[PDB]
Amino acid sequence: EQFLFSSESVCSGHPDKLCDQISDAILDACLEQDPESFVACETCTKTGFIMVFGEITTKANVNYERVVRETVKEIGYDSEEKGLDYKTMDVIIKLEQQSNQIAGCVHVDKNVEDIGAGDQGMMFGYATNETKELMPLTHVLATSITRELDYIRMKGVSSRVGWLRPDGKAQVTVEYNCKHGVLIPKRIHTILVSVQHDENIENEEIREFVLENVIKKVCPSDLMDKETRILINPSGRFTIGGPAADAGLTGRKIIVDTYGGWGAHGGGAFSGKDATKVDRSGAYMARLVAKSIVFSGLCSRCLVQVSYGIGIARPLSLYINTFGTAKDGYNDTKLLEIVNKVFDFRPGILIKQLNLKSPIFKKTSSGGHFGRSEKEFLWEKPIILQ
Amino acid sequence: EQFLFSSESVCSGHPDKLCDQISDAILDACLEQDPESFVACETCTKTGFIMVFGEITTKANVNYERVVRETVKEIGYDSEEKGLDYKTMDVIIKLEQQSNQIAGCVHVDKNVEDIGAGDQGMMFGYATNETKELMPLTHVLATSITRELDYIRMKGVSSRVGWLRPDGKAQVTVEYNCKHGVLIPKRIHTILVSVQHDENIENEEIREFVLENVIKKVCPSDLMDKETRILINPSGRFTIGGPAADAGLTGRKIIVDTYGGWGAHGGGAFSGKDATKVDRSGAYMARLVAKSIVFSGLCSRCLVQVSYGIGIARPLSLYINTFGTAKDGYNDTKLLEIVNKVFDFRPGILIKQLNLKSPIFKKTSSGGHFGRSEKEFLWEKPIILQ
Numbered sequence: 048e049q050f051l052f053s054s055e056s057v058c059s060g061h062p063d064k065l066c067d068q069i070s071d072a073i074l075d076a077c078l079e080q081d082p083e084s085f086v087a088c089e090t091c092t093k094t095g096f097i098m099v100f101g102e103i104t105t106k107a108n109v110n111y112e113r114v115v116r117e118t119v120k121e122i123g124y125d126s127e128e129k130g131l132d133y134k135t136m137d138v139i140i141k142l143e144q145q146s147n148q149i150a151g152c153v154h155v156d157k158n159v160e161d162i163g164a165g166d167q168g169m170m171f172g173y174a175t176n177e178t179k180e181l182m183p184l185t186h187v188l189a190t191s192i193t194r195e196l197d198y199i200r201m202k203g204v205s206s207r208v209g210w211l212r213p214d215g216k217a218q219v220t221v222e223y224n225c226k227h228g229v230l231i232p233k234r235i236h237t238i239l240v241s242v243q244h245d246e247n248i249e250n251e252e253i254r255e256f257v258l259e260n261v262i263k264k265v266c267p268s269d270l271m272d273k274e275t276r277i278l279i280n281p282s283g284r285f286t287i288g289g290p291a292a293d294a295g296l297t298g299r300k301i302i303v304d305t306y307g308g309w310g311a312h313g314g315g316a317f318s319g320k321d322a323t324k325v326d327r328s329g330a331y332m333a334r335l336v337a338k339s340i341v342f343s344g345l346c347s348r349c350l351v352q353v354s355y356g357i358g359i360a361r362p363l364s365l366y367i368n369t370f371g372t373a374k375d376g377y378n379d380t381k382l383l384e385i386v387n388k389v390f391d392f393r394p395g396i397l398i399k400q401l402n403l404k405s406p407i408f409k410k411t412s413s414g415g416h417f418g419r420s421e422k423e424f425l426w427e428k429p430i431i432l433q
Numbered sequence: 434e435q436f437l438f439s440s441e442s443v444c445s446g447h448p449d450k451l452c453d454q455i456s457d458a459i460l461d462a463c464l465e466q467d468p469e470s471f472v473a474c475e476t477c478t479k480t481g482f483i484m485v486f487g488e489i490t491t492k493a494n495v496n497y498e499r500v501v502r503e504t505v506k507e508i509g510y511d512s513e514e515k516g517l518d519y520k521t522m523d524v525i526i527k528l529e530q531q532s533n534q535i536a537g538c539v540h541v542d543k544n545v546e547d548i549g550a551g552d553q554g555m556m557f558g559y560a561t562n563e564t565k566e567l568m569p570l571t572h573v574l575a576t577s578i579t580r581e582l583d584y585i586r587m588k589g590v591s592s593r594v595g596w597l598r599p600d601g602k603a604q605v606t607v608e609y610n611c612k613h614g615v616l617i618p619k620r621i622h623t624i625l626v627s628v629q630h631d632e633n634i635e636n637e638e639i640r641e642f643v644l645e646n647v648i649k650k651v652c653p654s655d656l657m658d659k660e661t662r663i664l665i666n667p668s669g670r671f672t673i674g675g676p677a678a679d680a681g682l683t684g685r686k687i688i689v690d691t692y693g694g695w696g697a698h699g700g701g702a703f704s705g706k707d708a709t710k711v712d713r714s715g716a717y718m719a720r721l722v723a724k725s726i727v728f729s730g731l732c733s734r735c736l737v738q739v740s741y742g743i744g745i746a747r748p749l750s751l752y753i754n755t756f757g758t759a760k761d762g763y764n765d766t767k768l769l770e771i772v773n774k775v776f777d778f779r780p781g782i783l784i785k786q787l788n789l790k791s792p793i794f795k796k797t798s799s800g801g802h803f804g805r806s807e808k809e810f811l812w813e814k815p816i817i818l819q
């Protein structure tokens with residue numbers, strides 16, 4: 048039994064991702080001065096403007112406007128024709144303090160270990176032995192394509208690339224076989240890439256460049272064949288991009304940020320939120336759990352759900368599903384027992400263990416939060432479980 | 434083997450849902466005058482303001498500001514102490530035309546049947562025989578709780594309820610047994626409800642009211658027991674709410690809008706988008722497919738994934754998973770063949786079949802898009818398949 052499944056990714060300059068990056072830049076700016084900051088920083092953008100809005104309670108003295116401009120500059124939006132110019136855009140800041148009624152049930156008069164969850168909600172973690180990163184192949188491939196475009200554009204290369212503009216998206220469809228719940232990729236069925244460009248590069252040149260310098264660099268040659276459908280810039284023209292073509296908002300790429308359609312999602316955004324927002328910290332710990340179970344060889348694929356209630360430290364529920372892939376002797380009931388001996392989903396413990404009051408978040412806000420090798424993403428360093 | 438699983442919902446007055454409703458109010462306003470409108474209307478809110486932004490190409494003459502104010506008024510935000518006052522708030526409108534490069538690959542010089550998808554992306558549909566609505570019980574229960582609060586507050590009741598303010602959230606955890614992929618609810622494990630209120634009603638009164646007039650009205654008594662954990666207003670005070678406590682944005686309740694963590698999600702928001710945005714139309718058709726397969730008795734649970742590329746009419750991939758619950762004689766390969774004989778995922782066909790150019794969308798923007806009985810949601814009227 049074969050089946051097709053698709054996942055997507057977007058470039059750093061995609062307007063929604065731009066907002067995620069600004070929100071996390073602001074979070075990091077607050078945390079570097081005040082690790083105790085409460086941050087719920089939303090960003091939105093359209094032609095010629097960015098607005099930051101939400102709730103921050105911090106002792107940090109942050110020039111929010113400069114943080115926004117520097118972030119946009121670093122992404123490469125330095126000219127109106129690219130879709131946004133950090134020099135000329137309007138930046139609007141509409142921040143207030145966190146509600147005292149929310150603060151009162153999170154930290155006020157509570158031991159650090161027993162701080163309340165910042166909200167209700169559910170979070171999922173997922174892992175799969177398909178890739179070295181323990182991530183789904185469709186997601187790994189789509190993400191690699193956009194990450195490679197961003198590297199080519201931003202870090203720079205010796206070749207002529209000044210035609211590449213910041214916006215872009217990719218989507219990869221893989222044909223799989225499923226054996227006992229274990230996912231075995233057979234072949235790549237379709238690769239779609241849309242990249243923003245300037246007005247003088249040929250479509251044929253764009254296509255040759257993306258195929259040779261991106262797709263063939265990041266997609267395994269043994270999964271591509273004559274029938275793999277390659278769709279590069281199917282719209283035929285993509286020169287107007289960024290906020291100039293499409294509004295952006297924080298937390299509108301939650302599936303790109305996680306598992307690409309695999310596993311599940313509880314609905315909460317990550318970027319712009321300090322770690323007392325369990326949307327973020329709960330999902331990061333759930334990833335560590337799933338990844339640790341797979342890394343330990345106890346199953347081939349694993350889904351974890353945790354849930355919380357506002358002002359309540361301990362999770363309201365925990366769930367583990369190994370899709371029938373558990374190792375002989377193990378099952379989901381036993382695995383939950385193992386998880387409970389090892390892990391503690393109280394946010395105060397979570398935060399300490401994963402160093403989530405340090406200014407580590409801007410790096411997570413493009414490229415996916417999971418399956419990452421950066422030493423500081425502690426949720427990606429698996430624990431050996433037995 | 435038992436397990437716990439949670440889903441959540443939010444009230445109509447939740448700031449994110451408020452934005453979804455405004456975005457869809459604007460969409461409907463455009464469609465009622467101009468069915469051919471291209472709409473990508475985002476909304477955001479914080480204390481004392483709403484901003485609408487994005488891209489609309491329409492022949493309609495819409496007073497966007499009046500639409501926003503009327504929508505907020507209808508939700509009940511008519512006083513600063515409730516969290517927002519439609520009379521006094523600033524309303525900012527930052528709309529531009531749709532990019533011609535996007536328009537050019539969607540409809541320009543194309544037959545109506547072969548219009549291109551408005552973007553790339555993936556969409557999932559899901560159905561399960563757990564409930565009459567063919568929706569997951571956790572989602573049905575959480576949604577019913579918030580829908581009941583909204584009905585009590587907005588339509589009104591003979592009892593004293595003027596203490597109920599517009600914001601609120603609920604979360605329900607169900608303990609399940611799983612037999613051959615079929616989900617059998619055993620009991621309700623936890624019910625969490627947070628409701629905004631004014632300054633004179635007792636916590637004990639709120640709790641008694643929610644338990645007796647909401648929870649016991651919508652949750653089956655035979656799934657509740659002495660060990661069911663009832664958590665009503667655990668923060669102890671929730672008087673400051675709405676945009677005054679928490680920023681809202683369109684498309685930040687995508688899991689509340691769909692299946693509550695069950696099935697899967699492709700990442701796209703629904704509200705504010707016309708039906709050429711396959712994030713919406715593709716998901717609606719995928720729901721009809723899943724629901725039709727379950728309704729037809731061909732399986733107990735069904736997940737559908739479709740994917741698209743920008744400017745391309747036909748889907749790039751289609752996937753059906755019945756979780757091992759297919760009826761004797763059927764399997765996922767055969768079911769995909771049946772789906773292909775019956776359904777056509779080209780957006781132009783989708784749109785015609787589901788009447789998606791009519792102003793039907795404001796109703797979808799609170800209460801979940803799926804599992805709804807309203808006659809006009811054609812994606813909820815199953816097709817008999819064999």
Ligand SMILES: C[S@@+](CC[C@H](N)C(=O)[O-])C[C@H]1O[C@@H](n2cnc3c(N)ncnc32)[C@H](O)[C@@H]1O
Pocket residue numbers: 061062214215216241282284285286287288289292293294471472473488531532534535551552743
């Ligand atoms: C298609 S737009 C979203 C729909 C849009 N808001 C509208 O008004 O129809 C989403 C994304 O597609 C990409 N995009 C924009 N212009 C494009 C083009 N000309 N060709 C291909 N992709 C494009 C950008 O990454 C953009 O953020």
Ligand SMILES: C[S@@+](CC[C@H](N)C(=O)[O-])C[C@H]1O[C@@H](n2cnc3c(N)ncnc32)[C@H](O)[C@@H]1O
Pocket residue numbers: 085086087102145146148149165166357447448600601602627668670671672673674675678679680
């Ligand atoms: C907790 S807030 C989100 C986090 C918030 N942005 C912050 O600054 O910490 C999310 C939602 O929780 C709900 N909420 C707000 N105040 C609350 C309270 N005092 N008790 C319980 N829930 C509350 C509202 O529905 C609100 O939209």
Ligand SMILES: [Mg+2]
Pocket residue numbers: 063294295299
């Ligand atoms: Mg978007």
Ligand SMILES: [Mg+2]
Pocket residue numbers: 166167168314315326
């Ligand atoms: Mg949430």
Ligand SMILES: [Mg+2]
Pocket residue numbers: 449680681685
């Ligand atoms: Mg929100």
Ligand SMILES: [Mg+2]
Pocket residue numbers: 552553554700701712
């Ligand atoms: Mg999308």
